[PDB]
């Protein structure tokens, strides 16, 4: 995407980090359910603005990372595909707007940015500026000018929905004794038994008054089984 015109991808229910042929990777992790994603081609200098807690025209007027997001970003030099003679003026971005962006805000209206009192009436002039810019990135580009391709990921960390990454597994099951457990949205250790009751199914799990987990809709049938902490006590 042209970053001012960024494009979502929404993905669930399936890592290339099992290689590192790609060059660049900003991250907060190293499996989980499902994700929102975006991607862009960017000149190597401007990537500075692409972090939580960042400045400048990108954070102003093209994109906004939430300063409290969670997610990861991978980038690599895309000169090889992209940094071609003369052209590449397709790859647009917004230089001005009436206001700064909120997280994942977007704007592709292209009215002339008036500035000050000027009733610029849709025509460019002094103090009457057209809102956008584009790289026109080319083979002579120094690396700060050269395009990197970049992909952006952020995590739908709610755990009742069923989804997963590509690389994951699961075992058989048993009804008793202490065991070490996992689910794509739940993991730990516990001494399981049956349940006296069943949930509203929208709830993935029952929880104690202490907020510890109590039961979960086990995907073997979304089934409901009720668990003591594994038998422990003073001596």
């Amino acid at each position, epitope marked *: 995407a042209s970053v001012y015109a960024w494009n979502r991808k929404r993905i669930s229910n399936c890592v290339l980090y099992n290689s590192a042929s790609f060059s660049t990777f900003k991250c907060y992790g190293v499996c989980f359910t499902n994700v929102y994603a975006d991607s862009f081609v960017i000149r190597g200098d401007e990537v500075r603005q692409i972090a939580p807690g960042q400045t400048g025209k990108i954070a102003d007027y093209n994109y906004k990372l939430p300063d409290d997001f969670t997610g990861c970003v991978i980038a690599w030099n895309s000169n090889n595909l992209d940094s071609k003679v003369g052209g590449n003026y397709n790859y647009l971005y917004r230089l001005f707007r009436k206001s700064n962006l909120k997280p994942f805000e977007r704007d592709i209206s292209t009215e002339i940015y008036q500035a000050g009192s000027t009733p610029c009436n849709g*025509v460019e002039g*002094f103090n009457c500026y057209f809102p956008l*810019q584009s790289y026109g990135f*080319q083979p002579t580009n120094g690396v700060g000018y050269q395009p990197y391709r970049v992909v952006v990921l952020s995590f739908e960390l709610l755990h009742a929905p069923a989804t997963v990454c590509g690389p994951k597994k699961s075992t058989n099951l048993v009804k008793n004794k202490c065991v070490n457990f996992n689910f794509n949205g739940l993991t730990g250790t516990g001494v399981l038994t049956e349940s006296n009751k069943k949930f509203l199914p929208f709830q993935q799990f029952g929880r104690d008054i202490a907020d510890t987990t109590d039961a979960v809709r086990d995907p073997q049938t979304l089934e409901i089984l009720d668990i003591t902490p594994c038998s422990f006590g003073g001596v």
Partner: antibody
Amino acid sequence: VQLVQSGAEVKKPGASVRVSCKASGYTFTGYYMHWVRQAPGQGLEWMGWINPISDGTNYAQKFQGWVTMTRDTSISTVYMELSRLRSDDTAVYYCARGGSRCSGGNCYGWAYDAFDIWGQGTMITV
Amino acid sequence: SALTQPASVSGSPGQSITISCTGTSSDVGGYNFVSWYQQHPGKAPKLMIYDVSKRPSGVSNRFSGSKSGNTASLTISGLQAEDEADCYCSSYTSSSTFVFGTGTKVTVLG
């Protein structure tokens, strides 16, 4: 720096005529581009501009309703059509690329970087 | 446009004949954006001033652009026989328009 345009697209009077101009070396899109005309011993007109990085324009309202600018990014090219003219509309007509603002780069890479090559809207005979 | 300036303003070298490119407080005095040009006829022209007096890069030699109010007021900063030539003027104008002058022939004296 490069700039070129079409020459004497001659007619017989009353009619429409097309033009193309071309500029490069300069990052052709970098700012809005202007049309200009003069004739021998006459003054020089400006008639409007096109923005490469949009479709936006200005005109001199003398000319709107019978002049017809347009621009390209597939081949870094720009174009004009002068249409159904008055009899003996005849001169030489041109392209140029100045204006109000830096738009980065050479922060005043401006008008006479491109105030350039010529062509002759005309009628003639063998 | 009716914006105007004389013809064949002339002199012997070094005498620095001066060009009252003149218009209106809606154009020349309207705007901080006035512009000036010269040439040997038939060539593409030669700009010397783009705003009041600020010369482009390379434009320095024997140039003295200026404005006050509704007059752009360029001094050619002394003639130097430089001129099988003619001289011209322009500005940016209201509604982001642009304007041009009559221009002015030059001649050189002994």
